[PDB]
Amino acid sequence: KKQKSISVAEFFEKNRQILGFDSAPRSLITTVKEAVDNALDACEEAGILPDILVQVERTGPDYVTVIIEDNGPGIVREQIPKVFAKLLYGFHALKSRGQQGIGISAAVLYAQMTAGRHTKILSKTSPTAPAHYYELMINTSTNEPDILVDEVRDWFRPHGTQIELEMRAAYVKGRRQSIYEYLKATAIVNPHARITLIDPDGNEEVFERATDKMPEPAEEILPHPEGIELGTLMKMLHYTEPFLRYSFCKLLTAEEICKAAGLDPEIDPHALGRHEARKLIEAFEKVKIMAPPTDCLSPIGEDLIYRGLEKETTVDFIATSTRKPAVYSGNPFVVEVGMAYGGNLPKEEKISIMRFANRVPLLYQQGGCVTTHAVEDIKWKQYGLNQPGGGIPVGPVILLIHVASINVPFTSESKDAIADIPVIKEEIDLAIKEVARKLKHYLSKQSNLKKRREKEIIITKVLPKLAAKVAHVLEKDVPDINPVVAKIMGNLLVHRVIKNNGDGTVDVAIKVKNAYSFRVHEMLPCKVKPEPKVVTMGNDYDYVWDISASAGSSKVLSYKIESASEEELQKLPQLIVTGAK
């Protein structure tokens, strides 16, 4: 981002895009793409579930006013310039949003430059204190700002700080996917925050959600070799100062490195050279040591994520996963992945995937984003979502992929996607998979129940059918629809064939199609078999057989006479698996 020299507004109009402002639609959103994060950045420090009201009235032909009420701790009077302007250089390699300060400053500028009306600011530190109101401006040339109003306004219910910006841009488009989506996106990932939005013309989306558990504390660190390069050594040396156990986190490895470069384990720090630099740089490469730090990042959370969605949408089956912190050439990172299936979602295909970078969102051209890629690189249909294409499985879903790292690998020079790094995708993958399966289970279970009701009808259908084949073919009647039906759900049929003579041979056959152990009774008056096992009650007796047939076994039980006809009037019970158990 350089530390310039002599030119101010230009810097803008020249990076009039790499920065974020090209068109009317992204003009506004960029402003909020900042506004809202400074706030979370603020509060998240010591001031709780922060709530943020953010308006935007229609002012004139094509200009707009944007209100952004804080709720944080307000800001120190001699620190406005520093937080609402950005001409700072030099440090700091810890996990947050906007890629280094460039934030809000941009906003002020565009407003200041497009429409031109200074910039309203208002804040209160705590309960009893003045509430200051500032009208800031940046008059070019002289880079340093130029405060213009520092009075004391009465009211506000002290404890926060609102910004009011007017600037020729365009909120208006809220359909195709622009603003509402941003805060909604912001909403779902930062559960620990209340977001109310009142958009021009009158309407009000209140993302009032919760589980007030402030995020895990953002932390800082020294760097690790791998990930250091040409620019690094120039910076390290040229300015500040043993330069090994002092500014390169996680003694013996100091004196051992000096040799592999051509330097003595004692010589002085600065003014070493411009060519003896390319030699020590690899003095790290070839000697891979211990490990950077794990105790260093702040995932959003397997749980919160869950909440995030369940509260801000309308899904049916959900799954979160926060994988252990992985690492690539020096920079630590953790990726969390959540997935939600159908409901309020879209009918067929058009899968929606919203990506999330170190808590910031992203809504600009998915193409190329390591995220989208990974999404296309694996499985597909045979998992649960029947969608052909050649990349990106589609149907009523919704996927969230998060990445955290003190510094992040972005493609274009304007944080909009992640560069396809081996050790990262190698992670997101088994991470998107991490749920890609928990879904299957659901579907495998869900769709399953269907294959449990399909049946219930092929048993009130298979019925009248063999009953239509009767009052239409003069053949006895509806010939045991049961044997067949039982062969469908494939349980095990138990029936009783019977023949009459000058005797009375009756056979009870049973056959399974699944693998169990069975107990079978049968009560009658006497009898004249393939092994019995009788007990007697009252008068009529009870013949209890005992069998255990499996797979596709088919056994047959028999016996004989006594009385007649009347017999056709029973239904033999069993014990295991009518029949109890």
Binding site: K461, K465, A468, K469, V484, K487
Partner: protein, 315 residues
Amino acid sequence: LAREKLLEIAEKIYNQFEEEVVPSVSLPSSAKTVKGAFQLLKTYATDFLINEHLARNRGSTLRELYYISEGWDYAKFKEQGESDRLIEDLEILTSLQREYFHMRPEEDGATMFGPIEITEQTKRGHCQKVGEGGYQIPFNVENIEFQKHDASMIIAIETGGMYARLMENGFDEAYNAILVHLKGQPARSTRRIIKRMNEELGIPVAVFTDGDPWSYRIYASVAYGAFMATPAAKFLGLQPSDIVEYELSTDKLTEQDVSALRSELSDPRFESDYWKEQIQLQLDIGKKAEQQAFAGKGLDFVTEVYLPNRLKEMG
């Protein structure tokens, strides 16, 4: 009302029921699950209106089917899109062309004129000289009679005119023939009549249509499919080669046609090298050709020049 040599196999549809039930599952050719179980139950509604209403005469149609079906619950119909499949299924399983089962369709196979008397049989309770519209073979082709054949050639023409004027001037006498107009695609009534004469009489039959592929497909819908053919027949109809030499006015063709020309070639269905040759002419000339157009070169022309002229050199 006959229909027993079929009512027999129509009940035999059932029989493959118990012999099908008593022992195992019940697949035809597939049954077993939901759409394959229901699709079956509706077997009933089927063999019910049929075998039980075959000996009581009455016969009905498709969009009535969708109604007489609103009777048998757990089996009714949600859309007249069912009529086909089932009835079209019957054509495959009981090997009985739809009609056989006592089904009338959507249209009227009227228009026929020639020298041959006949009668039909059912319904109640000359063909040589009847009227003008005369006989209109209706929804059936197996209710027959003949005995009178003093014409040695039949005629396939299409036009609410060419055929008409092929009546006034005639052709029916000193030039044999048997006339039969068709109005667009010829289905049952008509076709199974064309065939009935190309098998039970050994009597030739030629097609005379316009030029548009929409006519050249009407020969193929009589040539084969899409009991209903006359394959040994030829087309003396407007063939691309019998118009290059015959002056005749013309007309420009469009997109839907050129995409239709690469379809009757890049899809070899009855694509002989002779329907491929005259068709290739279509690619060249790049123009259409009405059917009644001869009128441009004399009114008493068709009835004089073309037909015979092209008719002596059979091929």
